[PDB]
């Protein structure tokens, strides 16, 4: 009940490596963690696959059935596929339904471990696919495992706090709980017209009854560890005192990290780690999730470092991975250095957003 649970199996990793947008990323992440032998300090739990009924706790049957329809062959000619979000971002590959079921089940499993109290922290670095809607694939996400996990945690915990530190706005998770006060979503993300998914302004606070139970922090390009943590710590301090969560689901997409081809934020795993630490000291049942991350080595770097933070261990600077060693070139170190790119976040705009948010969180009681 003090040792973190690590959702892992060779079958699971093999399945997660098959996502066309992040090939072999899951293997790289586990391999680096395995090389630091951090999995020895964690209880490794094999993930179950989500049943149709379990997946249908959020996704509609029409969508799920269309998923397994095009999945049993790899059909890309179905006219209704585009309306179900399938296409460029989410290709109608073969076995994509088993893929979704596997990832969805892994997060449910992690949530189940929290419920049973075999751990306070449960890790699934291959999850956090927060863009998926109830009947629509979106942004590399075919199925919203984050939502399925929050729903499962609600069997035991009354109020769930969702924190989304991915580069992109966690719209799918926000929309799923937009109407309720039992789950509060907090998303820090890049907000600019044309940039996916296009939602998550500071004025988006939820609907009707989930009003002020959705928090969005629009950030611009070039932000670094220091300022990011100050914005994050500020929001989470107000959020915690106001919402008083019984359990936390934390998405940690590494597409904020410097060196990512999307080239927006200028973060290092250290900055994300401080956010992690602030959440961990709440001593609540925490479900750790991955997400974005399109520099594979850096994503492996980040999540391996974060796993070290959770274990309270300091990792050696030298990369000990042998299978994917060359990928960490040319310097082969765990640490990441930010780019020489300007921070387009003026301190007064940030101050405005923090005031707006604080004004919203006063209604939460």
């Amino acid at each position: 009940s003090l040792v973190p649970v690590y959702i892992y199996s060779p079958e699971y990793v093999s399945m997660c490596d098959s996502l066309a947008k992040i090939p072999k990323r899951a293997s790289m992440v586990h391999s680096l963690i395995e090389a630091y032998a951090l999995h020895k300090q964690m209880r490794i739990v094999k993930p179950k696959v989500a049943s149709m009924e379990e997946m249908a706790t959020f996704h509609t049957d029409a969508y799920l059935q269309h998923l397994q329809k095009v999945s049993q062959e790899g059909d890309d000619d179905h006219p209704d596929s585009i309306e179900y979000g399938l296409g460029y971002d989410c290709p109608a590959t073969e076995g994509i339904f088993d893929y979704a079921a596997a990832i969805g089940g892994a997060t449910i499993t992690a949530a189940q471990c929290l419920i049973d109290g075999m751990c306070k922290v449960a890790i699934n670095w291959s999850g956090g696919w927060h863009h998926a809607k109830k009947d629509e694939a979106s942004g590399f996400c075919y199925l919203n495992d984050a939502v399925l996990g929050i729903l499962r945690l609600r069997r035991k915990f009354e109020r769930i706090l969702y924190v989304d530190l991915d580069l992109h706005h966690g719209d799918g998770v926000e929309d799923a709980f937009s109407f309720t006060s039992k789950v509060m979503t907090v998303s820090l993300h890049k907000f600019s017209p044309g940039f996916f998914p296009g939602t998550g302004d500071v004025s988006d606070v939820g609907l009707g009854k989930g009003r002020y139970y959705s928090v969005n922090v629009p950030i611009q390009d070039g932000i670094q560890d220091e300022k990011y943590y100050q914005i994050c710590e500020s929001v989470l301090k107000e959020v915690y005192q106001a919402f008083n969560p019984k359990a936390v689901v934390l998405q940690l997409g590494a597409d904020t990290i410097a060196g990512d081809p999307m080239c927006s934020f200028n973060m290092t795993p250290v900055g994300i780690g401080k956010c992690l630490k602030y959440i961990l000291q709440w001593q609540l049942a925490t479900l750790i999730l991955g997400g974005g991350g399109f520099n594979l080595a850096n994503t492996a770097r980040c999540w391996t470092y974060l796993t070290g933070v959770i274990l309270g261990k300091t990792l050696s600077s030298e990369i000990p991975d042998r299978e994917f060693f060359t990928a960490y070139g040319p310097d082969y170190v765990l640490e990441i250095t930010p780019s020489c790119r300007p921070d387009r976040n003026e301190p007064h705009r940030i101050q405005q957003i923090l005031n707006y948010i604080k004004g919203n969180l006063k209604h939460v009681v």
Binding site: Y88, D89, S138, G139, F140, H168, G194, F195, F196, P197
Partner: peptide, 4 residues
């Protein structure tokens, strides 16, 4: 609908 956007592209990611």
């Amino acid at each position: 609908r956007h592209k990611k």
